[PDB]
Design a protein around this ligand. Structure first.
Ligand SMILES: CC(C)(C#Cc1ccc(-c2ccc(Cl)c3c(NS(C)(=O)=O)nn(CC(F)(F)F)c23)c([C@H](Cc2cc(F)cc(F)c2)NC(=O)Cn2nc(C(F)(F)F)c3c2C(F)(F)[C@@H]2C[C@H]32)n1)S(C)(=O)=O
Ligand SMILES: CC(C)(C#Cc1ccc(-c2ccc(Cl)c3c(NS(C)(=O)=O)nn(CC(F)(F)F)c23)c([C@H](Cc2cc(F)cc(F)c2)NC(=O)Cn2nc(C(F)(F)F)c3c2C(F)(F)[C@@H]2C[C@H]32)n1)S(C)(=O)=O
Ligand SMILES: CC(C)(C#Cc1ccc(-c2ccc(Cl)c3c(NS(C)(=O)=O)nn(CC(F)(F)F)c23)c([C@H](Cc2cc(F)cc(F)c2)NC(=O)Cn2nc(C(F)(F)F)c3c2C(F)(F)[C@@H]2C[C@H]32)n1)S(C)(=O)=O
Ligand SMILES: CC(C)(C#Cc1ccc(-c2ccc(Cl)c3c(NS(C)(=O)=O)nn(CC(F)(F)F)c23)c([C@H](Cc2cc(F)cc(F)c2)NC(=O)Cn2nc(C(F)(F)F)c3c2C(F)(F)[C@@H]2C[C@H]32)n1)S(C)(=O)=O
Ligand SMILES: CC(C)(C#Cc1ccc(-c2ccc(Cl)c3c(NS(C)(=O)=O)nn(CC(F)(F)F)c23)c([C@H](Cc2cc(F)cc(F)c2)NC(=O)Cn2nc(C(F)(F)F)c3c2C(F)(F)[C@@H]2C[C@H]32)n1)S(C)(=O)=O
Ligand SMILES: CC(C)(C#Cc1ccc(-c2ccc(Cl)c3c(NS(C)(=O)=O)nn(CC(F)(F)F)c23)c([C@H](Cc2cc(F)cc(F)c2)NC(=O)Cn2nc(C(F)(F)F)c3c2C(F)(F)[C@@H]2C[C@H]32)n1)S(C)(=O)=O
Ligand SMILES: [Cl-]
Ligand SMILES: [Cl-]
Ligand SMILES: [Cl-]
Ligand SMILES: [Cl-]
Ligand SMILES: [Cl-]
Ligand SMILES: [Cl-]
Ligand SMILES: [Cl-]
Ligand SMILES: [Cl-]
Ligand SMILES: [Cl-]
Ligand SMILES: [Cl-]
Ligand SMILES: [Cl-]
Ligand SMILES: [Cl-]
Ligand SMILES: [Cl-]
Ligand SMILES: [Cl-]
Ligand SMILES: [Cl-]
Ligand SMILES: [Cl-]
Ligand SMILES: [Cl-]
Ligand SMILES: [Cl-]
Ligand SMILES: [Cl-]
Ligand SMILES: [Cl-]
Ligand SMILES: [Cl-]
Ligand SMILES: [Cl-]
Ligand SMILES: [Cl-]
Ligand SMILES: [Cl-]
Ligand SMILES: [Cl-]
Ligand SMILES: [Cl-]
Ligand SMILES: [Cl-]
Ligand SMILES: [Cl-]
Ligand SMILES: [Cl-]
Ligand SMILES: [Cl-]
Ligand SMILES: [Cl-]
Ligand SMILES: [Cl-]
Ligand SMILES: [Cl-]
Ligand SMILES: [Cl-]
Ligand SMILES: [Cl-]
Ligand SMILES: [Cl-]
Lengths: 219, 219, 219, 219, 219, 219
């Protein structure tokens, strides 16, 4: 990663063994459950493109997912290059070449060029741009590896309301879109797919009931 | 988090893999037992709103509770917005715009703006405001997910007094101000002791410490 | 905690995850065995009142003991306030208000006021004063949760002398008073409650025998 | 390793016990699965040749592979020596002699000469040259120790498409440029799908993403 | 402990949770095997008397040994006091009073006075004096708690010579100067070998190394 | 160990608990397998003689090996003293006495004298000299505790060539001499002790076949 020293300079630091192990283990145990995204973002804080490639390369298995990840990165790299055409010309003494999509992804850039971009003034944060592409890709994998659709979450006749809301939002969280789309899913399904006893109780509460009030009413 | 370095400057640091793992593990093993609140507050020392969102997003399961958490944040955010009316105007070079409710929660603010506020002179502790909203929300979850009421905690005829007082205060801590929690001790606590110990505790008279009550019902 | 930076200034540091886990685990495994006191004192090195409250709040179970702890803190807080009456008046630019008992315990003080007291010149060590109250309380719990009295430690007819001295001093250590009181207990009971074979051997050694000599003589 | 301290100077540091243990454990559990290469590269960040030799020497077993590693280092070292003819002459007070192939591998160079080269102005990154030779050698071991060929990876008649693509790319990663690895996807991958999914994938037509192919053979 | 920081100043640091845990665990698993002494000396590097008392107080069980430890400290403390007669007089602003025996053990000295002595110019290493008394006491415990005498360690008729020499020196290390420990080797070691190996070792003659003796009784 | 601070000064640091545990555990699990040597060298990076004695003293068991280690150290100490006769005379204000063999081994030197030697300008690296003696001794133990001779490594009639080369070089690695002696062992035995099928294949390859080519030919 790139961290600040006590001189105020952004300097390269080696990825720690603890960081490597934490990412390998979380994929091993949690696969592509939705909480893999925040874990990857936090463990990759300040990462260079080399570090991000290191983390993803240490993943054993799920190679189908990892190949989908490269294809996502490619489309975003192609989009970056079409929005940022590089201008030919000698690079000045105190300057860095402009990065391509392949440079952000680390396939045509050295770690020293990545450090130069990320510690420039102003910085060009190729690590954070790459991370955005990867997380975009990981969001697709989470949505694809989600077993259940939101339309199949129906409260059982003896199922506690808390367990049903647990399943509802767990399923909704794996299908990542905008929250405009997830507020619409709740208003459409959460009360309507409650069991007949709890459904009649919540209809009387009205659309303005908070979830805390809804969960108290079907206790 | 934003911590002070070895020279006296407030700097951003990445959340450590140990901090991430410790919070995930505590929710896994302890759910929303009352001791989850101090663990979250301590593990989030100096956290930015991004860090707090990271910690909350790494929680697997309990998505109904986490959704109640979201609803609580909204009410407090709306209260914050109603107490801090917006002032339109260009933000000056040196200073920073005033944060809205959605900015404290980190949903409409970048990490650099959160760092900018916290290292301002004087600091606007958006991380601590967000943390307070979260703990307010987590406190509600502990109360809702508490299985037993304090009025149902009563000492068995052969149960040692220590075990009953253990159950009593464990339940009371889950049942959340001291206006009536102070009230449960010494008035409900004696009433639900078994007849053998209850007769002993009348003889002790008012003003007995819990150490005196526990000594008196040892045998 | 409050630690020194390289500038010579006492600055606040976040309580580490390792410190939190160590205290939670030691209570889990050792309950209120006497070695819980030194572990708590060492793990709370440099703690603020907030940190001390954090540690105690993370304890799961033993809520009867924890309530006895608050009552001890209250008496010591009441004693502090009666020995340190606060003098009303505006606090000067370069000064701190005088702390109440409730301020030392952290119920009416912010963490910033605790930092101000502890890093003042000269410092008013509210964290170390609070720690003294807590450890005073923990000493009472260890004495109360001790199963055996010193008068019941008698050497068995086939029990090795080392095992008996182990039990003797383990029991004596849980009943914490002054060592004047513990030297008196040894001179009163250690030889007199030895088995008849070892007792006659040690009587000949006389009162001036070291324990190493006593343990060698009954090998 | 040679890392930058908190002030901006490149200093030698001892390899940490965690780094040593992490590398030993990864070889123990993963042998020469493809993900061993990124783990070794990351754990050896900033390594001197002595550090790289330390890591390789701590490997227990797989001594045939480790001997193949030695032979690879020799060929690259001999290539290095053939591209860098020796210049005889007294080495000047300030500067350092040119490193031979055996010097990069650390067999004829002391640790202080390796530090001297790496902190030179400009640096001669002997640690990174050695690391590159090692990874070149480790890449050969992964290919030789890969049990299955990509031409033998074919989808079963009842095997889910995700599991087959998982096996496909796991094998391809073990079978080492993208000149023909790009070729295996989309041409060999469709051919070895089962007849049910194979018929579906013809209908998708050329240019289908892997996400589209995996969605189309879900059911 | 008192350690040197990154700038060259001797500063007090809190004993780490890992140091506390490591010492507790080593006593739990190894008791007073001889290797407990080096572990305690190394884990207490730079310790203050308070730190040494902390480590000793965290030991659970073995309270008879710990009491023998207390008696040893008293004898050495009394010897220290007899060699350092007290000088009455007001202590000067800059300097510190001379420490008594009870001050080195930390029972009548505060932690700040122990820090003051150790950072004095020249230092009075009260922590190292206390540590030496403790190790003197712990050495006695290892001898008393050693089950077997070196005179009872003899090679079996079918026991491999390596295993017998292993038992021999393990016992000798437990049986504590080299005045007669040097004596046990080469004179008692040959005498207690079995007749087959014993006959071989006479033929080797005086001056054989242990490597030569172990090679000669391999078969 | 002796590490560099940020002032550029070589200063003493306490041996870490992690370093102590790592060395104890690696001996426990791996005994004197050849990889114990690099682990000991890396874990003892920058060690003083006191630290090296600490590490070796923490080893439980294998006391026969540890006694052979002292005898090796003695011969090397005697050789050092006969090559470096000390010159009598008062030591100057800014100087250190010359170290004996017993001073390098730490039996007649204080830790402060070891720090003085190791941080002198120029340094006299008693820690690295001692380490050379210890590793010389550990090499002898590895050779002695090796069960199998290189002449007994013969490929089985159904044994895969990789497994045979594994055994061959594992055995050769435990008998440490020069690589001139180990190149001679390979050319003498590796092909000649292959099974008749693989032997005839490799004879046709000729003496110039790399191991990678040899292992491919007997797949
Ligand atoms: C990527 C990254 C940089 C980031 C970020 C990031 C940024 C902001 C916010 C956030 C914070 C507070 C509020 Cl009040 C809202 C809001 N208020 S709202 C009602 O929509 O209008 N919205 N947000 C997101 C916004 F603004 F982006 F929309 C938020 C989140 C929350 C964090 C959070 C998690 C939690 F458990 C409980 C909380 F109180 C807050 N995370 C999510 O909400 C994800 N989630 N999704 C759904 C579902 F789909 F089921 F509905 C569900 C969640 C859920 F909250 F977990 C919970 C079960 C429900 N994260 S990171 C740190 O991962 O690296
Ligand atoms: C989490 C966080 C945000 C914080 C904080 C926080 C802040 C202040 C205080 C506190 C300090 C001193 C006093 Cl004298 C009182 C007081 N005296 S009184 C008579 O009420 O007026 N009260 N308090 C709480 C105050 F201030 F909130 F009111 C306090 C606590 C105590 C600390 C504590 C914990 C403990 F285990 C044992 C102790 F001896 C002291 N913790 C609690 O009390 C929690 N608790 N709750 C209840 C219940 F409700 F069931 F009865 C019960 C407890 C209990 F004490 F454990 C015990 C069984 C009874 N913690 S943090 C720093 O980790 O981030
Ligand atoms: C003590 C210390 C300070 C050091 C060092 C140290 C210094 C240099 C080198 C080294 C590096 C590269 C080459 Cl190309 C040669 C070479 N080329 S060669 C063909 O001989 O001409 N030689 N060397 C040693 C030289 F120069 F000293 F001879 C080397 C080693 C190798 C490290 C290594 C290990 C490995 F697994 C694979 C590698 F690619 C490199 N370690 C050894 O080789 C030990 N070993 N022994 C034998 C056997 F006996 F079976 F043959 C075998 C090995 C083996 F390699 F493991 C492998 C199975 C074969 N270590 S430390 C770090 O431990 O603290
Ligand atoms: C180890 C180290 C030295 C390094 C590096 C390193 C360097 C660059 C790149 C890389 C980055 C971006 C793109 Cl867009 C491409 C590209 N796009 S493409 C169409 O080929 O032209 N290719 N690459 C590799 C390049 F550059 F080498 F060609 C890349 C990688 C990727 C990172 C990655 C890993 C991952 F898991 C999932 C991802 F989405 C991305 N890792 C690999 O690709 C390894 N891999 N191999 C094959 C195989 F051969 F089987 F098909 C397969 C992979 C796979 F991706 F995992 C996936 C199943 C397919 N890593 S390090 C920094 O740790 O020390
Ligand atoms: C709270 C805190 C800040 C502190 C401190 C603290 C301060 C000083 C001392 C101490 C040191 C040396 C001597 Cl010679 C005496 C002494 N000489 S004497 C004979 O009395 O005249 N006295 N002391 C205490 C003094 F001075 F306070 F009295 C001491 C202790 C000892 C530490 C110790 C433990 C140990 F195992 C072996 C040792 F050699 C020293 N701890 C105790 O002794 C507690 N203990 N109690 C009893 C019993 F009740 F059974 F008798 C028993 C012990 C016991 F020692 F463990 C052992 C089985 C016997 N600790 S902390 C670090 O916990 O956070
Ligand atoms: C704990 C601490 C305070 C310290 C220190 C400490 C200080 C010095 C020395 C030492 C160093 C060099 C020599 Cl050449 C001799 C010597 N040569 S000699 C012929 O006697 O004259 N003697 N010594 C001890 C000295 F100086 F004390 F005399 C030494 C040791 C050795 C180091 C060592 C350990 C080891 F495992 C293997 C080694 F090769 C060397 N450790 C011991 O010897 C302990 N030991 N005891 C006996 C017994 F009594 F059973 F025979 C036995 C050992 C043994 F060696 F292990 C082996 C089976 C025999 N350690 S610390 C720094 O951790 O805080
Ligand atoms: Cl780490
Ligand atoms: Cl790790
Ligand atoms: Cl996996
Ligand atoms: Cl890269
Ligand atoms: Cl790659
Ligand atoms: Cl893989
Ligand atoms: Cl960490
Ligand atoms: Cl971790
Ligand atoms: Cl955010
Ligand atoms: Cl989100
Ligand atoms: Cl989830
Ligand atoms: Cl404000
Ligand atoms: Cl930590
Ligand atoms: Cl932890
Ligand atoms: Cl518990
Ligand atoms: Cl507080
Ligand atoms: Cl509270
Ligand atoms: Cl509880
Ligand atoms: Cl470490
Ligand atoms: Cl480790
Ligand atoms: Cl080397
Ligand atoms: Cl070697
Ligand atoms: Cl091996
Ligand atoms: Cl070069
Ligand atoms: Cl720690
Ligand atoms: Cl720990
Ligand atoms: Cl003390
Ligand atoms: Cl005590
Ligand atoms: Cl005890
Ligand atoms: Cl002195
Ligand atoms: Cl450590
Ligand atoms: Cl450890
Ligand atoms: Cl062992
Ligand atoms: Cl020493
Ligand atoms: Cl010794
Ligand atoms: Cl031993």
């Amino acid at each position: 990663p790139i961290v600040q020293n006590l001189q105020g300079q952004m300097v390269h630091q080696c990825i720690s063994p603890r960081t490597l192990n934490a990412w390998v283990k979380v994929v091993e145990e949690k696969a592509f459950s939705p909480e893999v995204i925040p874990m990857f973002s936090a463990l990759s804080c300040g990462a260079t493109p080399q570090d991000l490639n290191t983390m993803l390369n240490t993943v054993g298995g799920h190679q189908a997912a990892m190949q989908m990840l490269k294809e996502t990165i490619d489309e975003e790299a192609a989009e970056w290059d079409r929005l940022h055409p590089v201008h030919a010309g000698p690079i000045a003494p105190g300057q860095m070449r402009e990065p391509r999509g392949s440079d952000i992804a680390g396939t045509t850039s050295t770690l020293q060029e990545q450090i130069g971009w990320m510690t420039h003034n102003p910085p060009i944060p190729v690590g954070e741009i790459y991370k955005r592409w990867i997380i975009l890709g990981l969001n697709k994998i989470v949505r694809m590896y989600s077993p259940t659709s939101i339309l199949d979450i129906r409260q059982g006749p003896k199922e506690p309301f808390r367990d049903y809301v647990d399943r509802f939002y767990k399923t909704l969280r794996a299908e990542q879109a905008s929250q405009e789309v997830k507020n619409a899913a709740t208003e459409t399904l959460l009360v309507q797919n409650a069991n007949p006893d709890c459904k009649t109780i919540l209809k009387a509460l009205g659309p303005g009931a908070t979830l805390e009030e809804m969960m108290t009413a079907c206790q």
